[PDB]
Design a protein around this ligand. Structure first.
Ligand SMILES: OC[C@H]1O[C@H](O[C@H]2[C@H](O)[C@@H](O)[C@@H](O)O[C@@H]2CO)[C@H](O)[C@@H](O)[C@@H]1O
Length: 392
């Protein structure tokens, strides 16, 4: 049930929800409207689940790739900022939140993965992925390891899969061909094979997740990790002297991270749309609002021109944008959910050894193109009981 007269905001648990809450407190000081920020697990799947029945948060934060699927499902209010407000954000960010001719979210910040390295353990980080096995062996001889990053989310392995030619959906001349999936071509195979070989050769562990990799890097056990700007705050707190730099190349080609625009959508079922717009435009998307969030966990390259002009001087933001330029902006099309599901399965199954790389990526190509298609529907949530009073 969406309560009228307050704002409930959902944002992922790796981002600056405490900073966002401080913007919420200022909003409440000025308007009397309470703002509650939450960071539920599996947020990108929980939101459409509950929003399809007319429930959930007033405002949902996620990278823009999920938002077309939400908008297709009728879950997002159309936003209509004044032209003067839109001009305060970089024009391309509005295109990341445009779906079937409608703006369906407010852009917040540009996210790209970078290579993060411990300068004391590895002052000259590898320019190539191919160098990493030898670096790990040298570090293993001294009780350390070269690289740990989250192997549970395909977001983190995609830059390497895409480096030598892997792609999600083919596009040209303003349109994707969503039946032309590029996760099983030679470049995709070569990239995932390199990753799986790192695991088979004991340079990484298939079970490593976000927390395990973060703990190992921030405690100086591994020389490198792969992560986004939000992760820098926890490293700042640690004793690690780190750099943020370009991802290693593979087969002479840049790693190509999928670039996300962290975006704020308004639940189409929210009875607080006017307050949500006021909060997002006049409190969050200001220098002071973004500062509060960014101070908690860095946002990346923010969409708000006035504040990005400050942040762009940070060499970590420069590295973020160098990696971003070498990658691709994620599609926001609904089939992105099938793509991510397919690649997640393939990476997990190839890394664990349940399938070979070639078997896993053959399945992933057919899954993303033909054999997976998610449709949200309020019926999926109904439970029938003998008495109609106990149904729901
Ligand atoms: O791993 C697949 C996952 O990738 C992206 O999710 C990112 C998100 O964009 C970042 O903001 C951060 O939270 O890390 C996530 C990966 O754990 C896509 O946005 C998402 O749709 C996709 O499932």
């Amino acid at each position: 049930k969406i309560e009228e007269g307050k704002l409930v905001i959902w944002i992922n648990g790796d981002k600056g929800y405490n900073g966002l809450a401080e913007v919420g407190k200022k909003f409440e000081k000025d308007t009397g409207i309470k703002v509650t920020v939450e960071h539920p697990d599996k947020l990108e799947e929980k939101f459409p689940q509950v929003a399809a029945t007319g429930d959930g948060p007033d405002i949902i934060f996620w990278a823009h790739d999920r938002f077309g699927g939400y908008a297709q499902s009728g879950l997002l209010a159309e936003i209509t900022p004044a032209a003067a407000f839109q001009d305060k954000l970089y024009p391309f960010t509005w295109d990341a939140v445009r779906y079937n001719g409608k703006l369906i979210a407010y852009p917040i910040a540009v996210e790209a993965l970078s290579l993060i390295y411990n300068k004391d353990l590895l002052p000259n980080p590898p320019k190539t992925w191919e160098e990493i096995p030898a670096l790990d062996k040298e570090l293993k001889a001294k009780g350390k390891s070269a690289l740990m990053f989250n192997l549970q989310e395909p977001y983190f392995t995609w830059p390497l899969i895409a480096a030598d030619g892997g792609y999600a959906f083919k596009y040209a001349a303003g349109k994707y061909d969503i039946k032309d999936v590029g996760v099983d071509n030679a470049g995709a195979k070569a990239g995932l094979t390199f990753l799986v070989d790192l695991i088979k050769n004991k340079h990484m562990n298939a079970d490593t997740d976000y927390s395990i990799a973060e703990h190992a890097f921030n405690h100086g056990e591994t020389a490198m990790t792969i992560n986004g700007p939000w992760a820098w705050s926890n490293i700042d707190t640690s004793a690690v002297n780190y750099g943020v730099t370009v991802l290693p190349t593979f087969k002479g080609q840049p790693s190509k991270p999928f670039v996300g625009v962290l975006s704020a959508g308004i639940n189409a079922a929210s009875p607080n749309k006017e307050l949500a717009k006021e909060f997002l435009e006049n409190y969050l998307l200001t220098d002071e609002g973004l500062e509060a969030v960014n101070k908690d966990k860095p946002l990346g390259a923010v969409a708000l021109k006035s504040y990005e002009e400050e942040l762009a001087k940070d060499p970590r933001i420069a590295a973020t944008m160098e990696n971003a330029q070498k990658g691709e902006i994620m599609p926001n099309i609904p089939q992105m959910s099938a793509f991510w599901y397919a690649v997640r399965t393939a990476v997990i199954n190839a890394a664990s050894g349940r399938q070979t790389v070639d078997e896993a990526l053959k399945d992933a190509q057919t899954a993303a193109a033909h054999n997976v298609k998610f449709v949200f529907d309020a019926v999926t949530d109904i439970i029938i009981k003998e008495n109609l009073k106990d149904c729901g």
